[PDB]
Design an enzyme around this catalytic site. Structure first.
Site: not given
Ligand SMILES: NC(=O)[C@H]1CCC[C@H]1c1ccsc1
Ligand SMILES: NC(=O)[C@H]1CCC[C@H]1c1ccsc1
Lengths: 304, 304
Positions: A41, A143, A145
């Protein structure tokens, strides 16, 4: 003496953390040998995240679109591929800090250390468990992730988790390092409810052994129980069923303390039925389930 | 989102840990520049520890009696001195992994990370607080002495704690890196009782702000209080008195959440008077006092 929620030393993983940028999205990658592993992503706008077609989004991306920085030195990307829900970015330089490492898919109830990271920079380290509903209860801001979960056996880092997503209930979902989500979660901004967060019974029992070893014994009773009888109580309290496998795993704690697993089960049964009556165990007012039997042995014996 | 007991990344401190051996006693040392810092009781037999005369014991010791090993390579000791309760061993080689660092004596209520170590090898990392009775509630087995507590500001490691001793009550006493004990503790195997372990009120309040920021709000009430009125309640529950200094420190959490410090004090007052009635806050069934206001800001903002 004393018992602490203890993480592995994070040094070996610190040396692998990099920043990955694709267009306007920055998150963390893991640099092992000549490959940087990151959540796919990274190629998405938060607009994309509502219903992304990763294969289609990735056609538009070239190696030079993946900006990979380790400290303040840029890595040259010579290759990119999608494996499940991660990107593998081939760089022209092997990470000289690459530790001995394995990729492992852990079972629910298994504990690991998270090195939370932002812009490839470590902020902190904490111990987690894979919940039986395949979520983790983390601490992750925008940030974070690509931050990774890991275990260390002497000198070998077993990576088990890469962080991808926060559920609308503020619990965390992610993948192994092959990019397969734990549980039924997808990398999409969509209705995803976690199932029942059951208590990890074998971990609670391990923690009760740890308490006994550390002098917190007030909860030891005169009673015993049977696996079947205990399991009726565990059903009632959304505890995981206890198996003979769990009993065998608890064997060394049983031997050390001289308290038969089934006796300790009867102590846990009373604690479930009666509560702690305003008392504490190893400075907790609830039953801790994020130490494994292995964790209790390691901390209580001092393995390095 | 989510809130975790988070330690600093331990990598920078991992690179400083060595093994120090004097006769039959092995414990951990801290190698910074061309000096190894370790507890002076390294020169003691557990027989010595009943009433040691360190000055007299040290006359019998030469540089070659201090065996210092960093991994599997021996350091050459060219000098030794006692500073308070630590030994400083001058070695012929500067630790190439020496981070930017400071020695700081912390105040009670201040939090830090411990890298627990055995034979100079890191086993794990956890977050601690200096208790108001100048003990820490650690996890330390035989061989853990010389393990160090630290904070990190970007790239600068502030060492605050070196582990020396377990009290017969299984709490931990130690020194700063100038070898001065926190509290009234001495490096002798003797009757040493800790005073009253008071709750760190400003830390509990910071943690309540962290809970509000993370969606755990059930404990917010319709009431307010005064510093003097709150402090009567705090006296009753062995909470540290709350000062205007503490109120000022909580200012940014107050501003972020829009909950006046004194309102939150009234929420804490009700929780003290009423208990949590079987409910939890950030997955705790008691009031957590080992996050500082700075800790809450850092974790909740994502500082690296
Ligand atoms: N639910 C989340 O974490 C969202 C907010 C920031 C990342 C975005 C996402 C959604 C599916 S994977 C990454
Ligand atoms: N209370 C303790 O930790 C004793 C047991 C092992 C070390 C020894 C000691 C005593 C005073 S300083 C170090």
């Amino acid at each position: 003496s004393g018992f602490r929620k203890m993480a592995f030393p994070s040094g070996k993983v610190e040396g692998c953390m990099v920043q990955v940028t694709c267009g306007t999205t920055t998150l963390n990658g893991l640099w092992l040998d000549d490959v940087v592993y990151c959540p796919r992503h990274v190629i998405c706008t938060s607009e994309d995240m509502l219903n992304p077609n990763y294969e289609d989004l990735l056609i538009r991306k070239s190696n030079h679109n993946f900006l990979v920085q380790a400290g303040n030195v840029q890595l040259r990307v010579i290759g990119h591929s999608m494996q499940n829900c991660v990107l593998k970015l081939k760089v022209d330089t092997a990470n000289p800090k690459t530790p001995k490492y394995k990729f492992v898919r852990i079972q629910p109830g298994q504990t690991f250390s998270v090195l939370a990271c932002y812009n490839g920079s470590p902020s902190g380290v904490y111990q987690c468990a894979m919940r039986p509903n395949f979520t983790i209860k983390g601490s992750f801001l925008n940030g974070s992730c690509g931050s990774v979960g890991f275990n260390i056996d002497y000198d070998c880092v077993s990576f088990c988790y890469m962080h991808h997503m926060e559920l609308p209930t503020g619990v965390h979902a992610g993948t192994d390092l092959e990019g397969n989500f734990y549980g039924p979660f997808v990398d999409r901004q969509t209705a995803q409810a976690a199932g029942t967060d059951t208590t990890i019974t074998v971990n609670v029992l391990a923690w009760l052994y740890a308490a006994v070893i550390n002098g917190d014994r007030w909860f030891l009773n005169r009673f015993t129980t049977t696996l079947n009888d205990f399991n009726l109580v565990a059903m009632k309290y959304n505890y995981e069923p206890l198996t003979q496998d769990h009993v065998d795993i608890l064997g060394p704690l049983s031997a050390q303390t001289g308290i038969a697993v089934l006796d300790m089960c009867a102590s846990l049964k009373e604690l479930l039925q009666n509560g702690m009556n305003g008392r504490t165990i190893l400075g907790s007012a609830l039953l801790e389930d994020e130490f494994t039997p292995f964790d209790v042995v390691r901390q209580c014996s001092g393995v390095t």
